[model samples]
Target chain A: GLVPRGSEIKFLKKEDVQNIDLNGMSKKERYEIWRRIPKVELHCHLDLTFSAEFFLKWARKYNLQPNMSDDEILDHYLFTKEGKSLAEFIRKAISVSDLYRDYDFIEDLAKWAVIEKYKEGVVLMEFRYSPTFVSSSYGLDVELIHKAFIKGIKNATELLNNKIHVALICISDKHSGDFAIKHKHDFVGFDHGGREIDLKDHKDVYHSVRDHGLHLTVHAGEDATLPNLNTLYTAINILNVERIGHGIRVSESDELIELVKKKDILLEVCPISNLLLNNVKSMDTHPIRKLYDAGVKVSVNSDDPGMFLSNINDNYEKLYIHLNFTLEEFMIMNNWAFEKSFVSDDVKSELKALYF
Target chain B: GLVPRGSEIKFLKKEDVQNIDLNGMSKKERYEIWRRIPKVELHCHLDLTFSAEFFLKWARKYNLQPNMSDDEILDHYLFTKEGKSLAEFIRKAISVSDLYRDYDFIEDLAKWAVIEKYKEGVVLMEFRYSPTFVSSSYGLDVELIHKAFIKGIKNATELLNNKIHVALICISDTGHAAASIKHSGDFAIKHKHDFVGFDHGGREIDLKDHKDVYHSVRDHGLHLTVHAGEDATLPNLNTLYTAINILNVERIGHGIRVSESDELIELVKKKDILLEVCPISNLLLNNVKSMDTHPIRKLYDAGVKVSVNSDDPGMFLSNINDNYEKLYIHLNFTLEEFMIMNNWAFEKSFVSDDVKSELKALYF
Candidate 1:
């Protein structure tokens, strides 16, 4: 049993969580409980969370002349306007890639990103961003850019009065594998980008990074060019990942899900991110419920809060309304997130005790 | 065969209204076409179109106090909040029923309803209302109430310089059968030139008992657009069948549930009957779930003649243009086919040919 009957908030079993009596509860009441679930957002991107107000100053610094007007830019900066395609969203990213060239921009945006999750009730979070790929290609030292983000996050975390443990995951390459091992204390884990292939080339680096003291999470079920599970198999077999970012394609195979469940891998499930990317056709087709039902560990996450106009709570609420996610299941995911988090021992015990 | 296949605006058949290519066109480009469809709204209720400004004037005259501020009344006057119920809407109607009992108020409100639709791109429209029922049980003379509405419509139409044909259709209540017939039939026939059509609100079973009036109204050349195959039926569209066969009406109001029965769809199709689908009213009143979920798209895709309308625009906080925009955005509704609905509306309209030709030339 996960929790005894004496506790009002936690449930005893998955069956108990599924069968929790929620009749006669107003939608507002259910949403408040979900909102206050003491969440652990395992897969948010710091570069995507900075306010448009900050972006205004950053863009002005570089004379950002996007095809769209500044007013139109501000309008869509918050939402993925009603309908869009894959290439169109990339163009939106490329337009602002100019501003990401600045060192302070990366640091300040990271700090801003930290304070935001505090409002969303995320007590523990892991922020992932490409260290070398702020916008376009830049030859800046990958180590200091990683330091820039760390300074920004530390600044905001201190301002929070330590109500949050916002950790950073440098979306790294093999070039930074040794650089990552050196700063393992500053960084809790190493994650790769949307689609990349250095995991096989540097199992030694990946295993060594985890061998010394850090964590590892690789994206799987990405790209239309290959089988969705092609990379996931490698992530689990060749190089060990503590978590999987958008393990969306795992639910396609019962065999793969069994392997994931056996290893107890936490899936950083980003529903809307996959949706706007056309990874899944609609919200109802999402494998979140399937993964939750099959005794697999899955955590609700916001992959790109800026692009999708959704936060971790908004994703939780989407699961609440569309997928019939209950408060008990949300608690399970949050507790699992805390258990699988890459924070230090005291940070883990202190934070896990609060919710789990 | 429809237009020698050469015309840009007109299409060949129902099959042609569907399958119109919009591959490369932008959403903005498609929307401009639907907005400029030269619309003819077929089933509007003029009493429901009375503005909050008009409501305030009449409510003050009656010493009304509902505890909501005057500003709040204006905000909610158009049912600004969505997902309202049928009973809630009726309760809203009851609060303002007293104003309709006043003759001058009805006359002024009717004129306002006309000029208002002009702004909504209504070149031709049929406004149906209860001549016997204005507010609650005030018992105004039905004949005089009908006259008041006609005068209002006439006054507004003249003000538009006859650019918009504001036709009247008196909705009959079965409880007031003989009274409804005598007043609505007699008064409508008396002013049959402007009162272009007749309709009934009581269900199909009631249509049998009221055939004598419909028979007489039809003989007088007034068009009939009965409320049939609407929401009430479940087993079949037998009511719609009864309406088409028994009453021989031209248009079906809220005929959204015709998708299930292919023969019934075929039956309606064979007759080329128009479906006055109200997207906003159906959604707010909880008929269908959402905009795209509404049956208007299905009916159009199946080649059923369909036109968008706002049944109670004021009560729903929607208008004809709002309905057009929703269809364009949600349903991927093409401007190419919306052009057909406007042509369909003009052909099915109860207005005279000379005036129809003028409006058609002015619009097309």
Candidate 2:
């Protein structure tokens, strides 16, 4: 795992690393290269990324009864308690969404997100916010909320002094699967143009959306039972997914090994998200080893790292410590992630410089 | 979980339930029922059930080099520790099998097992042990060990004055998967008149030795995996069925649930092998979906030991007492099922007595 630099780190020019070959360097030297590498984040949730001060300001602005103390906000909005079920954590994290009443707060949060992403070496970031969650919370129109998120993105890029692409992900939970699809199309119709929809349902609806030009990905197959794998493959072969989120359960099957290798599908293997869910009993028993052994294409990313308490580099370090992985393998996983990202060619070129 | 009676409690009968039924009978009522009713255990491992006194005597006789005090031996061998893997527990239990060398020790242990069963209200029981474990520890031949076990069994029948039919089981580990098959066959040939043969492999091979063991048991014409379907330690589906179809097991010990297979599930539904389910064991291991989702009633409804077992009385914090009571209270088993499962266990159990008298006395 790579360590954090002082405040923020940015990519250096090719001539800087061209003087020293990265492949011939030691792990410490290679880490220095990765540290200066320009990164791009393709996935992150905006609702879960709100800061404590922003919520306090919202509580004051709205004049809400039963005012939240810092501890209450920490428990309710900021997830610090370990080992809560997904539902328990989400029910608590939803309080942060209560702050987004107008376009100004939305734009401010978006600006902060861009700043944070850039601090960790991400030059281009795509932050996804659910218009449904905002509109439902404030009784505002969904179209208006979508505009506010887009306005926030346009304003945030100006302040952060970085070129960023913002994607609108209409959040889909198990109960709201049909409702989320309706909102996704509604938002897409309004020139708020991010065609990707993240579905929470593991089985039925994820496969249905991919053909309609809405890129499909679902939170699948992390439970202890083998049925999670059955649902994961259903999304891949049946749904035609190019990338899978949390395909940890595939480690338990031989058939999955053959299928993933044959298909050349990529898995967004999140380490901290998995540990928080207890899909794996311990970090020592995590399936990343099996994934590496089977030659599966995997990338370590932080899913809701702010709430779950991790970031991309933090995850990289944790994977190294937990699995005792060599630098060669870590760089390979990072390179796989870098190549699979949807960042622009300019950003890709900057990221590719780290391999020098 | 079963509560241990000191082999001194008065004989409590089924008629006792009629009077206690007025007070909204507690789970202990079923424990009382388990005590009075005839029961059979097809999958119980004999070496796993050692009393405290048995360990002390074994250590003194052998002067073995564990280099521990009596308390340590008692802790390691005689007593049970919860929350350890089956492999860890079995390893320590194998070390304690050194005590079963003398024919008298064997007789006392066998009689104690039967008498203990009767106190817990068992009418018949099949005690499973491997001859290799005994012989390897004591430097005795297999035939002599079997004969000594038989003599201990005879002495137990005379001392308890209880007509309990006792049977034996011989097992093979994965490394000796071939040796286990040969051992089981030789055991069956030697003790066919007095023993019913059951073949099993343990933690030494969870998902490993299914085909070889099954074929060996199938070739020797012996019953297979009498104790099958242990999910706590994650035994696979392929091995669970090898016991049912290929090995032709007469009983399944912890075949708690035939998970991950629909076809094999249907096969167990039709088979005669009584499923011996332990509720606390299933709960402790997180194998059942939850306390509510256990398949004891499902298998019972399908006519699968459908009998209850203690598995390890001390380790699971259970014994015959709570295991029987659980069938009704937590599992929602009907009184009809309560009676039927115990009767099935008695019928299938290897316990021997004047058959007509036992049948006449224990039957409803």
Candidate 3:
């Protein structure tokens, strides 16, 4: 179910036919010969990837209703049922998330996310969560949603040895307007900054995030416009964003091009998400390759792997085979992921050591 | 089918109904009549409405394969299917929007939107669109999208007596920074200051139409605007208290309660975005509505920016004049301010000050 295990062999075979040179290697070949690189992941969401079964179990534990059968739940959340629509699948996931309305579910989910990261051999993983989604149903005020997620993260990290670091993303609605100042320090700060409605009312959230010393990222112009890139450039120039998520449109802005090239702000690219969300229809049309070629620092990520039914490896392999990234490009991407990660300097150095 | 035709009536029986005295008229009776006021609309997206038949036509037009039936499309886009979920619906809407990739379709849809609005008696309208959606398929630059929509709007306006304004909203996406000053004015600069406001920065709860995007939107130095707490809070006075206190917005939209809070009233007194109240639209969309208790009168009494709007008139069967009559009959508002409301629109209008000045001079 998780990328079909030995399917990497078939995947690489198709890639070899496409790329025309696999170093004469067979299905047994792993990229290990060139370099047994150690992978690291930062800035991933806990809610997006939680298994539907696991979520339902928690839901039952909490006595949440409208519980569907396990297959129905799986079909609902996994986005795998071909006949059903994408919205159907997403609803299933949100329905399951009803149990996450309380502090306990959030805490458990946070812990579970860390354990999952560790299982994937992520030496240093940073889990990002939206504190806003934790509602009052769990007997906590809106502010407590932030508190519980942060608490869960801190407690979970205690069980690990430099393996996981949880960072809470406190969100404000596009309609909320300058959310951070009043929202307080419940979580890390982010600009969920794109929609049909403008954000002239919410600009203060950017400066507020910087003031709090929380690392920042803004969702800007992923599916929309070149002008959208201009908004992002100003966010980096004015708000001082540490990294950019999606940032596909960033490649389209001249100002963004100049600023990103000069500042080297890392772009956390999510190719599968782009295709799934109709931001882009296919992987061949993605901008991550262009971003890298343009000398804008970019790291491939699975924006919502569970939602897209993909992962970091699936993303990398797609780029490797279809985009025809050179060995050098691949190495640089690996380096950028760690360099731009929100992990500690010590973990970054350790991760680098694992690469060699 | 629209809500009236789609009405299941929620199983209410004639016996269970509380009869209202229409004699002369009670407050609630006036409100009931107010609910049916005719309206015309200008700015709204068919994609946002997620009309199933509309989306399927678009999909077939573009030849994109999706793994669903027409009912599935409806379940995804319109939220019409009962027992489905919100997340799933939104996700499917996202997928169906793939048809927006075509420039011709985007323009056609823009034209269709105007036709729909006109059918509802919208005398004036502005169609704002995002250029990003059409850039790839048309192989046209993003600016071309603004031009295309503007062209469609102008054509529609010429065909009718309706006034049409066009502008491209700056959008925010992943990797895009918070809203900024530089890229804010990339499209529709025909009337130096007519671009009015902007809309960007969408998120679940973080970008909750909150701060990160606003500072930059305001930084663009345009008249400030934003969508605030409809799904979450009333956004009238209680919800946008922070926005009023901080953002100092010129218009409070879906601002159902400008009359409730003294602090909010004071804020709007200084910096008010005339409440763009969409009545039947709000009820259809699940924001509370009891016309007898609506705060428009209270806000009007307090002298807030209380403008009645249909939001999407065609979708809601509302018209501009009908909206005014509703306020007059149900809320007992005087026309003394109505004339001022019309003039005030130009003053606080996203239209250029020069154009506003010209309009005002013509009126006087």
Candidate 4:
């Protein structure tokens, strides 16, 4: 039965989903089931989520002989094989940005990101990238880079006959001083990205962005070992961002949890990206369930499917297998993302209808 | 008396120009004299040559109230009063890039740069901008930024009834990847009607060469220009040699040091490559101590093709008109030689033959 409207604590009992062995399910069965479920992705990097083979193909397209065998390429890209830290994982994934230097490659990568999301059963997706990093790092044009991204997304939506809807989020780093206010129309919202150390320097930018009437999200609470509550508080109270990405560490403080709940802020929790990046020692220790139980809105997301070598389904399955999120909680999380999405009210209704 | 046509050196007697006090001339008279001369500017940054008043208006446009009075705004941008070094002057001038955040402002600035040139008697102008720098520095889209630039230039050209022709030059810096090469090549070819050339205008000390970039731009049938021979500390002539021998640039920006060696002068003469000489820019940057010691006259006398320009009018507080007046009043350039230099600029300019003919017909 559907959870009653406005039910805050709607969840299946332990006995109801206890016998359901997610680990026992066949890969094909899991894929089919996950593909059938409607999902929304609010936080994903368009540059970092492409398949390894796709990147290799682009390397060939650009005539960049990365010279690695297919297996070595996989090892190079999939974080588990090479990444010892979040920084390391990000460095390995940045190879994708290397290929993103030209319009053709960017367009192709943008379309493929959407197409891959569609394959993994994402009905609505909001992909983000720091246009400055994407263009400036390689000395490319930022306007053209974002345009090609939009063009590619538009191309994919048309190719799918308009089944999937996608929007773009522009990520801001220390480098994007006044870019958000400058190119405000190019994105639905602004997301603070890059290392947390640098995110503090963009305080004025965040303040100005809020003043300019754009939505904001900050990547915080993903590093529990570090004292990041200040970062979270800045995002919540000072910047007053609508949502928080990977705010899993809210479980560390009862006041923070209560504050998030009272403020009605949604947390985008990427279980796999967190595990791969070592933000959490293991999925069993992930606070998503505890936070969900404590009345904080949380949604599962695939932060970088290509780097983590996981998809939305894998994220859901791993949480089910380890964190014990009931199937009803899965549906609730899907609705949570829908409720917190930076899309139009009409699009929200459409997404709700698809899930409900 | 004129020197022979094939003479190695040609200059007026020192006695004739030594006693001519340009300080006695009225600003109005100087302007009237310079305004009458036809000119073509092959090298100028579109974002760096507006009046201080115009920049203050744009600062207001972008909602940046620098909280300064009119004179403060002038001091902030004009760079004549407060600048301590070349780096400081460039840093102050970069405030113009702040107002260039949105497409509307960029388009307006682009058109205004051209209109300002047209107002100063520039019949043909080629302005360059580093798309990556402009867009990335402000977190803007490079494609739309450049498209807006083209739009503004085209809008101004149409508004002026095509009285002045304008084209864009895309600058590549040290950080440009292979993708930039391929993409810039495509961009140049796709917008060939408005984009006339590519320019290497980044740090000389970084010493980034662009043979592939030159080949890519040339393969698309666009002109090439290189910025070299400016400032001390670097081997300016050596850089110019690399620009000529390796990059095969058609024009050199600020190659004032070509007179340092007869061999280099001969090479420049043999290639027929024009030197875009900005006199005030050289002086303010401390490249030369005085107007008399500057190398533009020497380069011109040595049979090197050189044209006077205002490298950055906003920073130097001069325009093409001021550049012309300086060449005439201080450097002893005769009105007849000014006409000859204008013709030489027209010949070296990157424009269609029909437009060139039209310009020649209009000016000559």
Best-fitting candidate, measured by TM-score? Answer: 3
Query: What fraction of the native alpha-carbon contacts across the interface, defined at 8 angstroms, is recovered by model 2?
Result: 0.00
TM value for model 1: 0.45
Model 1 sits at a Cα RMSD from the real structure of 19.9
Candidate 1 deviant stretches above 4 angstroms: A1-32, A60-71, A75-79, A135-139, A196-199, B1-364
Instruction: Report, to 2 decimal places, the DockQ of model 3.
Output: 0.04
DockQ of every candidate: 0.01, 0.01, 0.04, 0.02
Candidate 1, position A164, lDDT: 76
iRMS of each prediction: 28.3, 25.6, 12.6, 15.7
Candidate 2: segments with Cα more than 4 A from true spot: A1-356, B1-30, B52-74, B78-82, B98-104, B172-184, B204-225, B232-236, B280-293, B302-305, B314-318, B326-329, B333-335, B350-364
Q: Could you give the CAPRI-style class of model 2?
A: incorrect
How many angstroms is residue B44 displaced in model 2 relative to the true structure, after the best TM-score fit?
1.9
Chain A only, candidate 1, TM-score? 0.85
Q: Top DockQ: which candidate number?
A: 3
Chain B: TM-scores of all predictions: 0.83, 0.76, 0.61, 0.87
Candidate 1 lDDT for residue B212? 73
Candidate structures ordered by DockQ, highest first? 3, 4, 2, 1
Better of 2 and 4 by lDDT: 4
Instruction: State the DockQ, from 0 to 1, for candidate 4.
Output: 0.02
Q: State in Å the error of residue B78, model 1.
A: 58
lDDT of 1 by residue, B1-364 (tens): 1123342233123444355555555767554444445678888888777655667776666544355577765553346567655545654554345356567877988888887776555778878886645632344677777778888888888777665677778676544335544555665576677678888763234355466777788898888888876663245566777677787889888877776678878988899898888878777767677877877878888999988888886676566877887887788776676777777877888878887878766665
